[PDB]
Design a protein around this ligand. Sequence first.
Ligand code: FMN
Ligand code: SF4
Ligand code: SF4
Ligand code: SF4
Ligand code: FES
Ligand code: FES
Lengths: 115, 139, 239, 121, 435, 164
Amino acid sequence: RGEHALRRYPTGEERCIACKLCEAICPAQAITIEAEEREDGSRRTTRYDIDMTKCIYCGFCQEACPVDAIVEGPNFEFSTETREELLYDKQKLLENGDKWETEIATNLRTESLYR
Amino acid sequence: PPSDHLEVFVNEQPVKIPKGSSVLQACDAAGIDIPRFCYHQRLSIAGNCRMCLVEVEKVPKPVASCAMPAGPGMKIKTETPMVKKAREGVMEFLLINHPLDCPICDQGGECDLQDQAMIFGSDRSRFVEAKRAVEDKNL
Amino acid sequence: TNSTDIFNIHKDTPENNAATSFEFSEATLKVVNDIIARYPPNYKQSAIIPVLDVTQQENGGWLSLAAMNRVAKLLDMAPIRVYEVATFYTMFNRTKIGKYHVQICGTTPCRLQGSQKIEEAITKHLGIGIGQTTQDGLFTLGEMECMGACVNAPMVAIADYTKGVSGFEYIYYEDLTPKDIVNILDTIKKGGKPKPGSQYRLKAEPAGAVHGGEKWVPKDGETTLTGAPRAPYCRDLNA
Amino acid sequence: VVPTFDWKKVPVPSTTAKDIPVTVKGATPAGDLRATSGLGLGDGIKNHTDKWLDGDKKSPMEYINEVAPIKVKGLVVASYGSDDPALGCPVEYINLKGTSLENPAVCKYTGNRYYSDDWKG
Amino acid sequence: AKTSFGGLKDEDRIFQNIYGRHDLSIKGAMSRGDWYMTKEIIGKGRDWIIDQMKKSGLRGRGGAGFPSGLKWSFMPKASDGRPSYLVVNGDESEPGTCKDREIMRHEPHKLVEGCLMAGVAMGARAGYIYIRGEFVQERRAVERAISEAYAKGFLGKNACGSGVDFDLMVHYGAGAYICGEETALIESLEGKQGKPRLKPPFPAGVGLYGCPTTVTNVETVAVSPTILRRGPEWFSSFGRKNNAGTKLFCISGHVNRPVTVEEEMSIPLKELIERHAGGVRGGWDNLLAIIPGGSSVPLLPKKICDGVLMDFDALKEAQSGLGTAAVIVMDKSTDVIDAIARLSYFYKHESCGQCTPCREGTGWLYDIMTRMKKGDARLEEIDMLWEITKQIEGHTICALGDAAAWPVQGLIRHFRGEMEERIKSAGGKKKLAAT
Amino acid sequence: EFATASADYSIAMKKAAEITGAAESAMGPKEGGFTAGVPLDTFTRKARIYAPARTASQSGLARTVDFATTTPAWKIEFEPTAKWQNPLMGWTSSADPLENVGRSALVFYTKEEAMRFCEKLGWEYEVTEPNKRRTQRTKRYMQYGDNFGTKRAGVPDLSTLPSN
Ligand SMILES: Cc1cc2nc3c(=O)[nH]c(=O)nc-3n(C[C@H](O)[C@H](O)[C@H](O)COP(=O)(O)O)c2cc1C
Ligand code: SF4
Ligand code: SF4
Ligand code: SF4
Ligand code: FES
Ligand code: FES
């Protein structure tokens, strides 16, 4: 359970559908979500924040997600010099997922036999 | 008045109700809240969801409590094995064609179907066939 | 629900839209007004199913949106009730069909007698499956449930829409083989009248049977009501 | 008796009428009411994607619009979003009758589009 | 008391022209005894006709079997402000059943006189006949008989010169099997979809147009004038106790001579099939199963059939029912799972969709049966199938849900070994690809 | 016979509330706030004593005053104070210490219990009695049999019959 990340389908569409289950289960209340409907009618988020200085790195959000959108990736080396660099918004989490997608998929090909 | 309030028995407890009341209203006056999907207080009675099924003495079938009138000296049972089996079966029939839509549905969190499935239904399904799909409507 | 009607909602077509016109003729309006008089005036809505049937022969074998709206205005009821009735019942076609509507029974008493081979013969001859119309607009193939002719299984019903309301014919053809239904279809196509009822006996009287769906095999045995009919009689109602 | 009401003579303020959030074709009729919340109103942002994406970066909606609809034989299709059903979305059963390449049916989970040439058309 | 039943004489058959051999006009019917002494029977009284119908032991020929004399007596005896209605059920959409077609096509004057007798017996001012919409020529023949009965003054004001008023009308449906149910028939006759009402209320209390109403079968109505003329003691001399009278039987399927034939009740199946129908195709030892009462009752195997009487209180103890007495015969070449699967398809197709268990579970039963036909199932799915039928049955608004559960119950009960062998041997063609 | 939730631990909670000597404990007005040790300006705020109505989205009645003797349903609520947005992230900021304490933690069986708590703590209170549900249905559609009655269009006139 490392740095949180947001994932896509192979087409390039976001997996997240703003169900707010990960926000409800979070014991630290480290997630803040706002949503409305997109211009094509889809149900998508407009804000998805994770306070990494409030997070406890439990993985409960990863368990609660029904579409495998939020994960905790294999990155542990993400120390910064300012605390404002650790208040992640939606764009940075998507950038993390776009960085770590192949490793996350390799990990999930094994861990889907157990979960 | 010729006894305008009649006495029924809900789980061996005597309950006085006004005349013309149904079995469901007698259960409500006894402090029991019967599961329902098609009954409404402000609408006419339909009787089509089959969720309000209770047991009445000397009746071999479950009765629909929303529509069945309450007679004098009637004995209503709401917690026998046939009532619980009826509730689980009717819930299972309600859920076989329903879409797996709770993450994208707006009723999630305040849904009668979800909460009644959690309380009066089972925890599993045995259905592996294809579901019914319906196009949406513009209103 | 039947064949040929996969939608329970209205689909716009150049033939079928809200701009399309329907109106009764004089004789059909006489028929419809005679139907309405069978029922109380404050319960005039009871007449919807026969009126919709008469409208279906008038329009040519199917109900359009304009026909349903005309029937709704005629019986002074909301159109959604008319749409409910028209979509609920199996005989009401809501898309355009051919001139003759061929309907085959597929329920188990007809199925044991070989209705599947009759369906195979019809599809091999006419070249269409269930739910389809021929390219000439002559025949429409459909499937039905039990038609109440099970002792003369396997059977086909054929509906005639080429003469309008006055010459509407709904004819049962019973005790069939592939040759019998091929001959009936050829007789209809050539302009003749094929013989109604059973092809090897008169009625539901005891005679042979279709063996395997391919050959009639006659069989002799005991037959009742072969003598003279009974005389009138009554007991003494006094005591 | 009971005269008809003329809705076309009803006045609407021009500031309100020009600010209605509507939709492109997608999963609705084009031009129906689009639900919005208050986020971005102080910064004058009326668009869904601009509320969280900054720059000329390729949006997720522009990614899914480049994938063509998929021809499926039958009347109903099951959508998982993956080859492996464990790795995708909960299964979505999408109606395919009345659908074509021009007016396909869309999955509410994945945004993939499907149509069928099997409904006698 | 007689012990052996069957071999009914031609002089005791009620329907003397069930084959349409004789003249079908009103002169042929009046010369054959119909419309005879009708004014004298009506002048006896309402209570007299009720008592005479009670003493006959005639039960409902629609499929349930309720006593007709007590049923007709449920109608009110005085005036409150509403008229009363007779409605006669001529739907006959039960698979296998084709007796009412013959009664409506070849003996309609018996039906019309019985409508008059029943309407007088129940205080009804008007009457409706609900004929099947597929029965077009039968409707035309019934309307011809009604026009003829009006032209001689038998129907209308001062009917048969008796002082009682009765009118008869013809309604027809448009192809729904569920419209054979009573309250569904009333709902379709009122100008709506054929969806049954919940009981209570009962049609004799609140029926058509909110008025007292009795729905009765064509065959129940038609035998009443012959019973009133020839006596209740004559009618009750046939069949066992509480099982009185004669019955039309329709024999279809794998039979050498399929037939609609009238016979005494409590006749054995083997007697009823070997005589009057030429026996089972290929001999009696080629029999596999028989449905004795249409389609809504469970099937019976060869061991039960050899010995059982075609009777109300005899098929019920054999875990079946008499129903409409429509007999469907299958032989040893029949895939009985495929036959009951097509029956499941019928009940899926004919569900009206009003209530949850029927509407959702008939399709589920059909899907499970379709998988069972190919053997693509598990052995415990048979017990699941029994559980699902027990979940539908007794839990719905009307009796089509029970009628959908019952054939699958009979198939499981009498041929579970066939279903298990179908599952086991399918893996001889499915597990050769897994390895 | 007596059976009012007689199969759970709530029997052992109703008694232990009526133990002698402890069932008659009482304090003067505002005295419990002096010994509570929280700042005294907190008791200058106003409180509302009320039982919340059933949500419109659902039909169940468990969180209402219908089950008042079974479940505590009366609440204490306070008026809102200022909220604003965080400049860096946009999160909702507040300076209210009583922002969720009445809605999460304080529940009472009756109205008088909540009043007693407010009186001993020093909060000034207003009490709102909930609106009572009506169970009697309309004259039309009173029973299921009134759907099919003669009140739809009156008694049918028999003047379109043959022979009139
Ligand atoms: C699904 C269903 C279909 C029925 N179809 C018929 C029918 O076609 N003809 C009939 O007489 N009764 C039919 N019935 C039975 C009627 O509801 C009713 O009990 C019967 O017609 C009363 O006639 P009786 O005089 O024989 O008692 C059907 C019942 C059900 C549940
Ligand atoms: S890992 Fe735990 S703390 Fe971090 S976002 Fe998920 S639930 Fe919250
Ligand atoms: S990340 Fe998953 S759980 Fe969280 S809102 Fe999006 S879809 Fe729901
Ligand atoms: S059992 Fe079937 S036919 Fe009868 S009311 Fe229910 S859904 Fe309709
Ligand atoms: S509440 Fe639906 S059947 Fe009674
Ligand atoms: S099964 Fe074909 S007519 Fe009945």
